[PDB]
Amino acid sequence: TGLDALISGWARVEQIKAAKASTGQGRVEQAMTPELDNGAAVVVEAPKKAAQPSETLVFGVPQKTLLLGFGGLLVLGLVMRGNK
Amino acid sequence: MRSFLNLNSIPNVAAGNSCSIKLPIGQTYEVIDLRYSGVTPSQIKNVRVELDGRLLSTYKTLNDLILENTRHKRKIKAGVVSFHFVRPEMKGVNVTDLVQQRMFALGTVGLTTCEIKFDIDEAAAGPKLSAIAQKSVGTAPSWLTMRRNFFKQLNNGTTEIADLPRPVGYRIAAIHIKAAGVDAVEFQIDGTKWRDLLKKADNDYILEQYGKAVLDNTYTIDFMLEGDVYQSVLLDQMIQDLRLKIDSTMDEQAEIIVEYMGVWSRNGF
Amino acid sequence: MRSFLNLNSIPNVAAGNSCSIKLPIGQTYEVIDLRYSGVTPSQIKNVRVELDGRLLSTYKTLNDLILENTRHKRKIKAGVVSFHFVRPEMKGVNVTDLVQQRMFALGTVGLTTCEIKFDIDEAAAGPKLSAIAQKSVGTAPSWLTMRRNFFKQLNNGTTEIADLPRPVGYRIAAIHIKAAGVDAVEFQIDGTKWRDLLKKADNDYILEQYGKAVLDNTYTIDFMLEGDVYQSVLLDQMIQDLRLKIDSTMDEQAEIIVEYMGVWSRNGF
Amino acid sequence: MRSFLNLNSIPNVAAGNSCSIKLPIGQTYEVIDLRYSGVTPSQIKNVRVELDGRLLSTYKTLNDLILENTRHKRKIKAGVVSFHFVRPEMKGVNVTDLVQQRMFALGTVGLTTCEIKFDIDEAAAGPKLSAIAQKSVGTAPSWLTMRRNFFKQLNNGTTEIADLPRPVGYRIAAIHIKAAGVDAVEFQIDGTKWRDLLKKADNDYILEQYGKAVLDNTYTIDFMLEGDVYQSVLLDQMIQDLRLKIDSTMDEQAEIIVEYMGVWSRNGF
Amino acid sequence: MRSFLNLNSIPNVAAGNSCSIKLPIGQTYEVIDLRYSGVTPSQIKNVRVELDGRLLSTYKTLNDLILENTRHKRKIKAGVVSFHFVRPEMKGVNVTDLVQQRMFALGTVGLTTCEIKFDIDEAAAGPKLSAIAQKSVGTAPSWLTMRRNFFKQLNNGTTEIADLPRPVGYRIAAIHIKAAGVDAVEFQIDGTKWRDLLKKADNDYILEQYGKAVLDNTYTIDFMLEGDVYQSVLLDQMIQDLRLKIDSTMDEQAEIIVEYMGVWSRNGF
Ligand SMILES: [Ca+2]
Ligand SMILES: [Ca+2]
Ligand SMILES: [Ca+2]
Ligand SMILES: [Ca+2]
């Protein structure tokens, strides 16, 4: 977290509000907003990122699949030597 | 375009009653004009601005809000007192002045409740209160001013106050020492003397020098005299000492007003 | 089968003397009944339970042990004070209640020394102390309750205490704030508010709701109200912030009692 | 770890008003502490616990909730009344006591709305109500206690009540006959006399024998005296007759309270 | 589901008469509530619980049953005395508490006769006795409590009692020494001192410490203070000495009550 980097965000938050205020369509967008005491909130933690487990599995299966390819290409290469 | 609305009627406005100004969630409240009659500002006690049940700002009496506005030389009118969420004195450094001022507006997006509670004194002649709202497009609570109240005893000689809350990431716009016998004050952080032992007359001269009005029986330490938010005290975690050295001439209990600032949080200050 | 033994005579029991209850190693001590006369519980200062010379639990005075038992509504008798190692209020979740309670017994197997030191006040009329032990088969010290003492300054307003020891792998059964002007308290871990700013009257109601007795000038935060050990605070090696927000009305120094829990280690907490 | 929260402010608390305690969905509510003042428990009428708009439990007045807690000898405090969803008196047979008690907690997972509606009497002096929630990890509504109200005319002589709802798969924890002239009662299912014509004095003795408190002008038929849920009446689809034979001495209107139990279903009892 | 039945009328209830409560065989008797009037509990002498003609438990007078219940702090009501076969104080170690308590219930399956005989004193004013049974599904007699009576003379000084019956495979829950001048007692098995020479005040303190009530002119040696059946004395065959060392201050004859336990046998204790 950076306080100056946040404050910029709040300064830049006002710029996008100013973009709406300049145009007539920005005013009509805000027309539907009402005032009531009924809200549907959802405040909860959320996980981020994942590295190593999917990799190890997705390195095991293709390496074997490739190795089977080499074995097939080798026997095809070796059989062409027999036809010489 | 802004919208000026006549807020819903305040329920049960009577002497000795505990009323509240419940604000509808959805938009942003820049200013709230509270009209009063049949009661004095001092008769409107324990004013609290609450977001989701949590305290944001507190005023011992409505008169403190009148003094808050008077200090910045804002328009004062008898029979009306405004809640200036948007700070008109703000000046931008890397953004426009307008952006820096509006950034303090009371956004309600994501909020469950927005209230302005207060108690009407029993001596109130015939209390009559109404409110008008100057609103704008909805925004999260975000950057807000958090007025906090503290009571400390002062001696006749030197008094030091170093136990002021230091919420991490937050800032301090100003500190108001409400006492009648304060001669000089000194402010320091980690030994560093940011404010020398300045005599009241000298401190008050600098205040007025920046378009501010000196409040009676108050020693104001304005950290945003230029209107620059980045001149305010940044409550950095590594801070080990936030001290105030008060030179008084009387033995009394002072009301220390601290204007905090920071991004409002469901689980913050 | 348990064994009830009349512990050996306590050496040099006199006013102003520093005595100790040396426990024989080999078995398990579930409860230790200390009979006293010619002296007040408050006159028995600095009570320390030591295992191998290290501190396990500490009591400023023997009166704190009386209050500890009173809180759980345990049998209190004048002239006697018991050390309840086995926690009778424990309830099993995946094991029997008996197993969960006995799991706190003071096993001595592998120990070199087991002592209960204390100082007899000089004002003691004519101190007379004897002890009886309710023992059972020997076990390692294992899971034990570790009562720790902390002193912190409380302000009139809001005080925050976030520097409480967080021994890794250990748990916190409860926290007792000993102060006369505490109005409300809030407990949070990593921003998460596990205990909202609960008013004393409300907190005390929940305590009594679980068969507990409210102690005078004390704000108890019981994390094991149901008797379930898994409800206590698990001091995860990943917790970033363990904070306490105290709303006081007085400016005093509070004695914070923290009941820790964990498998005793020769080089541990 | 449990969480103690100060529920949001109850909207429009005034005499003659119809208020509601809207509970946020997501977690589990073990207990709800309702603080009241400026109004009597009897002045809080038609208390309804609704899940998804459907009725779960009903109380003619808040005083019936006070009596419900008093009967089990739960902690009673003036100015506060708790909603014990988790049944502290439960005892496990093939599971731990804790599991059997917590199994009654009000889980909200999958719910759209969880409300506690009630009406404030017009005579209410100056009603003031607030609520605190003792919550735990979220769970489906699942096994819940369903308090149902029934009114029947009792004769001077013998009266029989066999038209009590028998929701299939559900159970009956207890039946409370609220009348002032009931001498003896007999309970039978399919001719089988599970409860002989027991005199009030004899029935009340058994109740007290299990730590229960006898309620005034009430004949309680506790089917869970031991705390064992499997002792309650299992409403089998094959049951042909569920009868109650009441021997009264007065001609009056009795309020029959039936404590049902079962897995909550959006389209069930 | 349990069944509460009004037992058949007790035949020939009159002063100086020898009556009996013949229990119908087939089910399990958890508790038997005996209502009495026109006679004192002390006027109901020689109470014997017989299974198939063999003595199970014996009470010199019905007052001893009242004291037995009082000791465990069970609900006591004037005009009624209950026979608690199921032990409510039992706590499970590897089974639930409920299972450990119900295991003491009086099962009648396989029995030919189940009786509760007693003699009504001649001085009885106008004896009136009735009984109510709290029954459950039938089970064999199985694990039962066998209260036995013994009379031994005490000296003023030390008296040793080592001739107490030691039925093989059976256990001893407790021993009650009924004498007015007992100062301290010591219990040992094969030289091993399981209970040091504990002073009455110290022994009584431990008893109360476990929710028990101290009986007048009685020194109770509770081997099941925790409610754990496996803490009781196991009368192992290889036992060579079961001794009791009583320190009295009077020369009198004491009534020694021994609460035995074991699986009931047609040809056992
Ligand atoms: Ca803002
Ligand atoms: Ca242990
Ligand atoms: Ca449930
Ligand atoms: Ca049995």
PDB file of N, CA and C in Angstrom, chain C residues 180-208:
ATOM      1  N   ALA C 180     -11.042  -0.113  36.570  1.00  0.00           N
ATOM      2  CA  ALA C 180     -12.323   0.324  37.117  1.00  0.00           C
ATOM      3  C   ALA C 180     -13.184   1.189  36.196  1.00  0.00           C
ATOM      4  N   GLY C 181     -12.600   1.708  35.119  1.00  0.00           N
ATOM      5  CA  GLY C 181     -13.342   2.585  34.217  1.00  0.00           C
ATOM      6  C   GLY C 181     -13.480   2.112  32.771  1.00  0.00           C
ATOM      7  N   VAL C 182     -13.564   0.800  32.566  1.00  0.00           N
ATOM      8  CA  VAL C 182     -13.727   0.258  31.220  1.00  0.00           C
ATOM      9  C   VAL C 182     -15.207   0.162  30.848  1.00  0.00           C
ATOM     10  N   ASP C 183     -15.589   0.865  29.786  1.00  0.00           N
ATOM     11  CA  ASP C 183     -16.977   0.894  29.332  1.00  0.00           C
ATOM     12  C   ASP C 183     -17.272  -0.196  28.304  1.00  0.00           C
ATOM     13  N   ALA C 184     -16.417  -0.288  27.293  1.00  0.00           N
ATOM     14  CA  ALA C 184     -16.593  -1.268  26.234  1.00  0.00           C
ATOM     15  C   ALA C 184     -15.244  -1.688  25.676  1.00  0.00           C
ATOM     16  N   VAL C 185     -15.211  -2.859  25.052  1.00  0.00           N
ATOM     17  CA  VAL C 185     -13.983  -3.384  24.477  1.00  0.00           C
ATOM     18  C   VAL C 185     -14.267  -4.049  23.140  1.00  0.00           C
ATOM     19  N   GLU C 186     -13.268  -4.045  22.270  1.00  0.00           N
ATOM     20  CA  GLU C 186     -13.388  -4.652  20.955  1.00  0.00           C
ATOM     21  C   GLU C 186     -12.147  -5.497  20.706  1.00  0.00           C
ATOM     22  N   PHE C 187     -12.345  -6.704  20.193  1.00  0.00           N
ATOM     23  CA  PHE C 187     -11.223  -7.588  19.910  1.00  0.00           C
ATOM     24  C   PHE C 187     -11.178  -7.955  18.435  1.00  0.00           C
ATOM     25  N   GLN C 188     -10.002  -7.827  17.831  1.00  0.00           N
ATOM     26  CA  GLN C 188      -9.852  -8.155  16.421  1.00  0.00           C
ATOM     27  C   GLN C 188      -8.514  -8.804  16.100  1.00  0.00           C
ATOM     28  N   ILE C 189      -8.513  -9.615  15.051  1.00  0.00           N
ATOM     29  CA  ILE C 189      -7.311 -10.300  14.599  1.00  0.00           C
ATOM     30  C   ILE C 189      -7.214 -10.128  13.092  1.00  0.00           C
ATOM     31  N   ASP C 190      -6.196  -9.403  12.644  1.00  0.00           N
ATOM     32  CA  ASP C 190      -6.003  -9.161  11.219  1.00  0.00           C
ATOM     33  C   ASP C 190      -7.182  -8.398  10.619  1.00  0.00           C
ATOM     34  N   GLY C 191      -7.634  -7.366  11.323  1.00  0.00           N
ATOM     35  CA  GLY C 191      -8.745  -6.545  10.856  1.00  0.00           C
ATOM     36  C   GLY C 191     -10.112  -7.144  11.181  1.00  0.00           C
ATOM     37  N   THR C 192     -10.180  -8.468  11.245  1.00  0.00           N
ATOM     38  CA  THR C 192     -11.435  -9.154  11.541  1.00  0.00           C
ATOM     39  C   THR C 192     -11.892  -8.897  12.975  1.00  0.00           C
ATOM     40  N   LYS C 193     -13.095  -8.351  13.117  1.00  0.00           N
ATOM     41  CA  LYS C 193     -13.651  -8.042  14.428  1.00  0.00           C
ATOM     42  C   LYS C 193     -14.398  -9.232  15.018  1.00  0.00           C
ATOM     43  N   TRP C 194     -13.683 -10.052  15.780  1.00  0.00           N
ATOM     44  CA  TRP C 194     -14.275 -11.228  16.404  1.00  0.00           C
ATOM     45  C   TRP C 194     -15.201 -10.849  17.551  1.00  0.00           C
ATOM     46  N   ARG C 195     -14.918  -9.707  18.166  1.00  0.00           N
ATOM     47  CA  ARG C 195     -15.741  -9.197  19.250  1.00  0.00           C
ATOM     48  C   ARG C 195     -15.995  -7.718  18.989  1.00  0.00           C
ATOM     49  N   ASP C 196     -17.222  -7.400  18.603  1.00  0.00           N
ATOM     50  CA  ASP C 196     -17.594  -6.024  18.322  1.00  0.00           C
ATOM     51  C   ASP C 196     -17.369  -5.188  19.574  1.00  0.00           C
ATOM     52  N   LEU C 197     -17.430  -3.871  19.425  1.00  0.00           N
ATOM     53  CA  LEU C 197     -17.284  -2.984  20.570  1.00  0.00           C
ATOM     54  C   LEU C 197     -18.473  -3.256  21.487  1.00  0.00           C
ATOM     55  N   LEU C 198     -18.331  -4.269  22.339  1.00  0.00           N
ATOM     56  CA  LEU C 198     -19.399  -4.672  23.248  1.00  0.00           C
ATOM     57  C   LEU C 198     -19.379  -3.890  24.552  1.00  0.00           C
ATOM     58  N   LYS C 199     -20.530  -3.341  24.927  1.00  0.00           N
ATOM     59  CA  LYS C 199     -20.646  -2.603  26.176  1.00  0.00           C
ATOM     60  C   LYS C 199     -20.472  -3.575  27.336  1.00  0.00           C
ATOM     61  N   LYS C 200     -19.902  -3.095  28.435  1.00  0.00           N
ATOM     62  CA  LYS C 200     -19.675  -3.929  29.610  1.00  0.00           C
ATOM     63  C   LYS C 200     -20.918  -4.716  30.025  1.00  0.00           C
ATOM     64  N   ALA C 201     -22.055  -4.032  30.107  1.00  0.00           N
ATOM     65  CA  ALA C 201     -23.306  -4.676  30.498  1.00  0.00           C
ATOM     66  C   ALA C 201     -23.668  -5.826  29.560  1.00  0.00           C
ATOM     67  N   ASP C 202     -23.382  -5.649  28.273  1.00  0.00           N
ATOM     68  CA  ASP C 202     -23.681  -6.667  27.271  1.00  0.00           C
ATOM     69  C   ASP C 202     -22.699  -7.830  27.340  1.00  0.00           C
ATOM     70  N   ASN C 203     -21.424  -7.508  27.531  1.00  0.00           N
ATOM     71  CA  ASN C 203     -20.385  -8.527  27.637  1.00  0.00           C
ATOM     72  C   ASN C 203     -20.604  -9.360  28.895  1.00  0.00           C
ATOM     73  N   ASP C 204     -20.911  -8.680  29.995  1.00  0.00           N
ATOM     74  CA  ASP C 204     -21.142  -9.339  31.274  1.00  0.00           C
ATOM     75  C   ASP C 204     -22.387 -10.226  31.251  1.00  0.00           C
ATOM     76  N   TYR C 205     -23.349  -9.873  30.404  1.00  0.00           N
ATOM     77  CA  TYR C 205     -24.576 -10.654  30.285  1.00  0.00           C
ATOM     78  C   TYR C 205     -24.273 -11.987  29.610  1.00  0.00           C
ATOM     79  N   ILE C 206     -23.442 -11.947  28.574  1.00  0.00           N
ATOM     80  CA  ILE C 206     -23.062 -13.161  27.860  1.00  0.00           C
ATOM     81  C   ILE C 206     -22.255 -14.075  28.777  1.00  0.00           C
ATOM     82  N   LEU C 207     -21.378 -13.481  29.581  1.00  0.00           N
ATOM     83  CA  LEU C 207     -20.561 -14.247  30.516  1.00  0.00           C
ATOM     84  C   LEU C 207     -21.462 -15.024  31.471  1.00  0.00           C
ATOM     85  N   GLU C 208     -22.359 -14.308  32.143  1.00  0.00           N
ATOM     86  CA  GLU C 208     -23.288 -14.923  33.084  1.00  0.00           C
ATOM     87  C   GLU C 208     -24.178 -15.943  32.379  1.00  0.00           C
TER      88      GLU C 208
END
